[PDB]
């Protein structure tokens, strides 16, 4: 194996109940080595897939090319750039900007959004 | 714990209480004063940790100030929190030896009944309380703390006379004050404080304990 | 480019903000020193400053040379608007 | 309203309204604040050789016309043995004073406030008598020496025919007296000021008159006067303007907000700190300082952890995380019986190698710390330090024998995962690995290439300063930081006052509180005369316990009700009286 | 020749150390006696702990894991060729011993960076203009505060940190 293997075991909150649609909680079967998820208000139970039920502090979420919705490119008050070549389309006109968050914490790194209809593609530098 | 660093702590509190005894005027060997941790490690045989005397054999007698009022005794209990029972057994040992004054250095906390009972036995025989943390250093060597001299009752009589004051008119100091506790001075007595000055250069003040 | 390399006792944002402030202060001080020198003996303004009557070197700097970096609460103008100080500027403009 | 009742009394001890003594002579010296002026202390002279060259009156005089220069008199006294012993009696005393003065001003500052400017008066004598600066004089050195002894006796500020009073006199004019004698030395007069005998006689008469005039007047409302004199520069400059300096800064409140914080005897200062000094190799090596700092820095496991995970794995020997499989090979002999007892709920922690390095901490110390804190119930195992991924593997064990569902298990069937979160909640928030108590994530590592510290004495006798490392800390635990190894237990100090009192005791507060007030005033740039500040701190400590100048402080004083009603609480105090 | 033991636990720990030394068969291209050396390692550890304690077991186990490293076989080779005696091996020469490139470099450069987080702490005010009236150094600081004023107008106050000396433009 390798340390290159990404860290996404499946955080997973919802796959809630199938009958009354309320939230499922883990609970043990000491007899078969199986995790089960049960609704607290009904007799419904089902085995879990991953043995993971909680993680905390990826600390490095890089949220660098996610949540940043492509429609941001229409904003006139953001700086258009003559700096060329979107990395997908053969056209310049990337709109760029810092952080745009409170969880960024100290970033000075630029984020670039191509603005022509052929991409919507986004990328850091 | 079970580590040599603990020895350093035992060594260091031993150094401080010896300086304190010395400063109360009690006769102590300068060689004891100079005794380092590596010397101590052989001279008391702080063994290899596990195996003996946590704080029962370190227990020491101190013998008298230039005026022979005879010995002072310094005790180091073992348990983290000391109960009245151990104090009572200790009291039996000091009485049978007929000690004159006891200093008790406790590991951590203090039973409130023990402090109370310690209070109540005071009129009969006198008895001191130090937490070990306060003895890990020697406050009298701090850059802020001036030279304190306890005055003899007669010298105070002369002081009140020469200024024509009354004891009440003087500046005051708590009995429970760390420096007051360090000399182990009792209520009603006066301490003479000598300070460096930015104008006279040297300034002398007095404080009544109360 | 993410190559600034933070100073050992600050974050990357704080290092940048310290560093531009050092340069813009350094700039005002050079031009300020330059005007006091360029002035002659007859400047009545120099006669009021030098006697110790009113004003100061920095006053001379401000009328003739350059006023410099305004301040509030100990740092440069805040982003009153979303990532801008006035509507007239481009977003996220950290220049002078 | 606090100080108002304090004034000089006719025996000169400054007392308040109920007649308690504040100081024994006003401002520790008997001198009023109107006629004192800044003067230099020649005697803090650097090299031992230069001082000896400059001050010693020569006897190994040149066989040439030597001495007929400067004096026509030395032809008279080149043979006297007694005059040689007496000047040697003077110089040894000067050299002894010189040693005392170094102890008084550890900072090696030679600027002190004194009455009667002796250089300008001496310069005034030369001007009036028209003394040629390059001719032989008729002045006699023994006349100067005895004249200076005579003049010291004449300069009495409070009567002393009593040995205690005689001693109170000797120390209360010590700084002026060494200043007088070091400036008016026989060689000083001879080699430099060239004064004549009547000129010297007038000079004694002048120093005598101005000094006696200088003394403070009994009756002066020095308490009222001192309060306004401190009050006035507090009106001046800086509400809360920031001064960029080193790495530090969001440090020590500056100005009026600090005056309010200090004077109220705040239990919760806005920015409490300790300036910690280092010793041995740790006072000059960065890496050693790093090690002590690490022990001091209050780090909690939450600060250290990269990541956490909870896994469902009853039997390790079939681990859900296939990569963990090697530790099972590694840990089959780790209490092999109670693998039949350990809960099927697993906690996994991932640690950062850079962050773990900075604290220089080991995995075994953590396992041992957590095991010791929670107890043998919390079964911990860990990884090889050389792995590229740092991991801690945690299960929970029980007491075996007693748990057989005797009644219903006194736990009320708490979910064990959920209990494992409570372990994770507490394990992170509580565990104080290496770092002990609250000095917080905030440390500062400062090089004192800055100010006037770390200076000493040398074989040359000069005040060659050191440049050394110190630690500024935002924190309060002054007591523990003193107890730690390699931290200098002499110079380590705090800007906090409530804590200084608990640890060091009331006299140390008197000094530190004067220093903190001195520090805010110097920042704001304006100077305040020392007497005024000494009197305020002395007014606040006199009762024994700190008297914040607020209604819960000074209005608890045993002063009369009618004074105390005019302060703040008014009606309540009159009702209580 | 190394002392045998009658304890089952110590004997098992020995074969585990021997098993750890057998990794990669490196011992073959040298032909050393890894079982005897392991017994000497165990004995040498025992000379320090003198107990079957967890701390002994952990120390043996951490020796075992460090010998099992696939990123640094050259360490094991160094032990196997007798360049590192067992009494030496009993105590680490580095945190998790990683000498022989890769991790030591990485640990060292990491030691550079965490020491780098102290280096200048951060200092200065930056003007370096006026020259001190005491220690005659030109490294100095200035303060600018309260404007207009009544009788103490805005003046430039200059302080020499370098010896706490303070003056005004004056
Ligand atoms: Zn200097």
């Amino acid at each position: 194996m390798e340390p290159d293997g990404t860290y996404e075991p499946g955080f997973v909150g919802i796959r809630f109940c199938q009958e009354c649609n309320n939230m499922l909680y883990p609970k043990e079967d000491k007899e078969n080595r199986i995790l089960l998820y049960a609704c607290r208000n009904c007799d419904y139970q089902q085995e879990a897939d991953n043995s993971c039920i909680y993680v905390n502090k990826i600390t490095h979420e890089v949220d660098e090319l996610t949540q940043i919705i492509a429609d941001v490119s229409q904003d006139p008050t953001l700086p258009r750039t003559e700096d060329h070549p979107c990395q997908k389309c053969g056209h310049k006109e990337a709109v760029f900007f810092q952080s745009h968050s409170a969880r960024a914490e100290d970033a000075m790194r630029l984020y670039y959004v191509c603005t022509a209809p052929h991409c919507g593609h986004r990328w850091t530098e | 714990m079970d580590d040599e660093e603990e020895t350093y702590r035992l060594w260091k509190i031993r150094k401080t209480i010896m300086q304190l005894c010395h400063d109360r005027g009690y006769l102590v060997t300068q060689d004891e004063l100079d005794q380092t941790l590596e010397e101590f490690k052989a001279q008391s045989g702080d063994k290899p940790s596990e195996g003996r005397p946590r704080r029962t054999d370190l227990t020491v007698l101190v013998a008298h100030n230039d005026d022979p009022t005879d010995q002072m005794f310094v005790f180091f209990p073992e348990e983290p929190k000391v109960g009245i029972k151990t104090i009572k057994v200790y009291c039996q040992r000091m009485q049978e030896e007929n000690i004159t004054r006891a200093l008790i250095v406790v590991q951590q906390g203090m039973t409130p009944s023990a402090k109370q009972s310690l209070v109540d036995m005071a009129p009969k025989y006198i008895l001191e309380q130090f937490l070990q943390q306060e003895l890990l250093i020697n406050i009298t060597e701090h850059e802020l703390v001036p030279e304190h001299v306890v005055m003899t009752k007669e010298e105070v009589t002369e002081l009140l006379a020469r200024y024509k004051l009354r004891e009440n008119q003087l500046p005051r100091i708590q009995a429970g004050d760390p420096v007051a506790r360090y000399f182990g001075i009792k209520r009603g007595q006066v301490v003479k404080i000598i300070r460096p000055s930015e104008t006279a250069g040297r300034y002398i003040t007095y404080r009544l304990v109360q | 480019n993410n190559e600034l390399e933070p100073t050992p006792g600050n974050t990357l944002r704080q290092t940048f903000e310290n560093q531009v402030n050092r340069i813009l202060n350094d700039a005002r001080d050079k031009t300020g020193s330059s005007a006091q020198k360029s002035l002659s003996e007859y400047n009545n303004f120099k006669s009021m400053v030098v006697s110790g009557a009113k004003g100061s070197k920095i006053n001379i700097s401000q009328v003739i040379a350059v006023v410099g970096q305004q301040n509030v609460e100990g740092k440069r103008i805040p982003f009153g608007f979303k990532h801008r100080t006035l509507p007239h500027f481009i977003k996220d403009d950290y220049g002078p | 309203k606090s100080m108002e009742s304090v004034m000089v009394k006719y025996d000169a001890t400054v007392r308040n309204s109920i007649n308690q003594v504040v100081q024994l002579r006003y401002g520790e010296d008997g001198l009023a604040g109107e006629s004192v002026e800044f003067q230099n202390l020649a005697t803090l002279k650097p090299s031992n050789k230069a001082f000896e060259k400059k001050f010693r009156f020569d006897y190994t005089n040149e066989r040439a016309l030597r001495r007929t220069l400067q004096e026509d008199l030395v032809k008279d006294v080149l043979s006297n043995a007694h005059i040689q012993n007496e000047l040697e009696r003077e110089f040894e005393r000067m050299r002894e004073d010189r040693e005392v003065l170094r102890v008084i001003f550890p900072t090696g500052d030679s600027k002190v406030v004194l009455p009667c400017n002796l250089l300008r008066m001496i310069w005034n004598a030369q001007k009036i008598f028209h003394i040629n600066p390059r001719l032989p004089s008729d002045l006699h050195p023994i006349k100067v020496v005895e004249g200076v002894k005579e003049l010291s006796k004449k300069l009495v500020i409070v009567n002393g025919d009593d040995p205690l009073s005689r001693q109170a006199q000797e120390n209360a004019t010590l700084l002026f007296n060494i200043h007088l004698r070091s400036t008016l030395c026989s060689r000083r007069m001879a080699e430099e000021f060239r004064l004549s005998g009547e000129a010297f006689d007038w000079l004694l008469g002048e120093i005598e008159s101005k000094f006696n005039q200088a003394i403070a007047h009994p009756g002066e409302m020095v308490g009222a006067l001192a309060a306004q004199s401190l009050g006035e520069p507090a009106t001046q400059m800086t509400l809360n303007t920031f001064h960029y300096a080193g790495v530090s800064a969001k440090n020590v409140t500056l100005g009026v907000p600090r005056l309010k914080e200090l004077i109220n005897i705040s239990k919760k200062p806005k920015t409490p700190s300790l300036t910690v000094f280092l010793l041995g190799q740790s006072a000059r090596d960065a890496e050693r300082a790093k090690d002590i700092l690490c022990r001091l820095e209050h780090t909690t496991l939450r600060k250290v952890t990269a990541n956490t995970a909870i896994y469902y794995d009853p039997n390790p020997q079939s681990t859900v995380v296939a990569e963990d499989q090697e530790w099972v090979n590694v840990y089959y002999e780790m209490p092999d019986f109670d693998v039949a007892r350990i809960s099927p709920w697993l906690l996994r922690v991932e640690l950062d190698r850079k962050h773990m390095t900075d604290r220089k901490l080991t995995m075994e110390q953590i396992a041992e710390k957590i095991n010791a804190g929670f107890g043998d119930d919390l079964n911990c195992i860990f990884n090889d330090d050389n792995a590229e991924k740092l991991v801690l593997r945690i299960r929970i064990m029980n007491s075996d024998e007693n748990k057989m569902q005797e009644e219903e298990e006194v736990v009320d069937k708490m979910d064990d995962d959920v209990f494992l979160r409570c372990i994770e909640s507490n394990m992170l928030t509580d565990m104080t690995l290496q770092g002990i108590e609250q000095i917080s994530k905030v440390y500062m590592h400062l090089p004192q290439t800055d100010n006037k510290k770390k200076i000493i004495i040398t074989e040359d006798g000069e005040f060659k300063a050191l440049q050394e490392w110190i630690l500024e800390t935002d924190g309060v635990s002054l007591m523990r930081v003193l107890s730690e190894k390699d931290v200098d237990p002499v110079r380590t100090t705090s800007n906090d006052i409530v804590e200084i009192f608990t640890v060091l005791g009331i006299e140390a507060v008197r000094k530190a509180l004067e220093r903190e007030l001195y520090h805010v005033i110097s920042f704001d740039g304006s100077y305040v005369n020392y007497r005024h500040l000494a009197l305020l701190c002395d007014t606040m400590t006199c009762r024994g316990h700190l008297m914040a100048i607020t209604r819960h402080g000074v209005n608890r004083q045993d002063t009369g009700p009618l004074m105390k009603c005019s302060f703040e609480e008014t009606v309540d105090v009159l009702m209580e009286a | 020749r190394a002392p045998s033991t009658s304890d089952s636990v110590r004997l098992k720990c020995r074969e585990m150390l021997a098993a750890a030394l057998r990794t990669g068969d490196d011992y073959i291209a040298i032909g050393a006696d890894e079982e005897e050396l392991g017994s000497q390692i165990e004995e040498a550890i025992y000379q320090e702990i003198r107990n079957t304690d967890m701390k002994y077991k952990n120390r043996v186990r951490s020796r075992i894991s460090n010998l099992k490293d696939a990123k640094n076989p050259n360490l094991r080779k160094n032990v196997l060729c007798g360049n590192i005696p067992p009494d030496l091996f009993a105590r680490m020469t580095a945190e998790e011993m990683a000498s022989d490139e890769l991790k030591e470099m990485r640990k060292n450069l990491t030691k550079e960076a965490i020491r780098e987080h102290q280096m200048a702490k951060t200092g200065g005010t930056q003007t370096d203009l006026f020259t001190c009236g005491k220690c005659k150094k030109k490294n100095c600081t200035y303060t600018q505060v309260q404007t207009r004023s009544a009788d103490e107008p805005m003046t430039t106050f200059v302080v020499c940190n370098e010896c706490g000396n303070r003056w005004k433009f004056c």
Side-chain angles (χ1 to χ4, degrees), chain B residues 66-100:
Chain B
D66 203 18
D67 178 80
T69 36
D70 305 333
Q71 74 292 345
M72 190 168 67
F73 192 82
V74 185
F75 173 62
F76 311 134
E78 302 284 352
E79 56 270 6
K81 296 182 183 177
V82 60
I84 65 91
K85 286 180 173 177
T86 300
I87 302 173
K88 189 182 288 194
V89 170
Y90 172 77
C91 285
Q92 287 182 344
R93 185 178 181 169
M94 93 195 172
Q95 286 175 357
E96 180 64 7
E97 194 63 23
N98 193 31
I99 304 300
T100 312

Side-chain angles (χ1 to χ4, degrees), chain C residues 1-77:
Chain C
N1 286 282
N2 195 42
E3 68 174 355
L4 184 61
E5 294 180 351
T7 59
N10 285 136
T11 70
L12 180 59
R13 188 169 278 187
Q14 290 175 359
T15 301
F16 172 86
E17 176 51 90
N18 172 237
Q19 174 73 241
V20 297
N21 174 70
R22 185 182 63 80
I23 296 165
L24 272 43
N25 185 54
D26 167 45
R28 173 178 64 189
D29 205 34
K30 280 171 176 163
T31 56
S33 306
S34 201
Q36 188 180 349
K37 189 80 168 297
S38 285
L39 256 70
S40 79
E41 187 65 17
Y42 298 101
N43 289 125
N44 297 274
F45 207 112
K46 190 164 174 172
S47 285
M48 284 186 283
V49 165
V50 164
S51 71
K54 293 296 293 177
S56 72
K57 178 187 184 188
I58 185 70
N59 275 136
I60 298 175
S61 304
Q62 299 202 329
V63 304
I64 171 65
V66 57
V67 181
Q69 179 72 84
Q70 302 315 303
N71 196 288
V72 285
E73 306 195 309
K75 49 202 301 186
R76 307 162 80 213
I77 302 302

Side-chain angles (χ1 to χ4, degrees), chain D residues 250 252-253 257-258 260-261 266 268-272 474 495:
Chain D
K250 331 104 219 334
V252 291
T253 309
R258 177 59 180 185
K260 189 170 72 183
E261 181 181 75
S266 184
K268 306 193 186 187
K270 296 301 186 292
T271 322
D474 152 49
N495 70 335

Side-chain angles (χ1 to χ4, degrees), chain E residues 9-61:
Chain E
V9 185
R10 297 189 71 195
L11 285 170
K12 287 279 298 152
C13 286
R14 289 182 179 205
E15 73 169 275
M16 290 156 54
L17 279 164
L21 290 168
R22 286 168 176 187
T23 309
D25 298 333
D26 277 293
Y27 72 101
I28 298 299
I30 295 170
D33 196 14
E34 84 296 352
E35 285 146 15
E36 188 163 356
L37 179 58
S39 303
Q40 289 186 55
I41 295 169
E42 187 282 331
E43 179 66 15
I45 297 168
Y46 186 86
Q47 284 177 12
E48 197 65 25
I49 308 303
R50 300 185 288 273
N51 191 22
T52 51
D53 197 66
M54 305 308 187
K55 199 170 287 178
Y56 161 97
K57 296 180 185 181
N58 293 346
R59 195 160 291 215
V60 169
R61 201 184 302 105

Side-chain angles (χ1 to χ4, degrees), chain E residues 132 134-137 160 162-163:
Chain E
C132 178
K134 186 192 294 187
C135 66
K136 71 181 300 192
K137 305 172 67 181
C160 168
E162 289 284 2
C163 61

Side-chain angles (χ1 to χ4, degrees), chain D residues 198-229:
Chain D
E198 51 193 308
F200 188 82
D201 218 79
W202 178 81
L203 185 72
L204 302 181
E206 192 76 4
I207 297 163
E208 183 184 333
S209 54
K210 264 88 218 193
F211 190 84
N212 221 324
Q213 190 184 2
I215 206 71
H217 294 177
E220 292 279 315
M221 292 301 302
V222 298
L225 176 60
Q228 291 183 355
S229 296

Side-chain angles (χ1 to χ4, degrees), chain B residues 151-162 189, chain D residues 164:
Chain B
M151 297 190 67
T152 66
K153 164 173 164 181
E154 187 183 288
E155 293 175 357
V156 174
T157 302
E158 291 298 302
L159 175 69
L160 268 62
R162 293 168 189 214
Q189 294 184 339
Chain D
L164 182 62

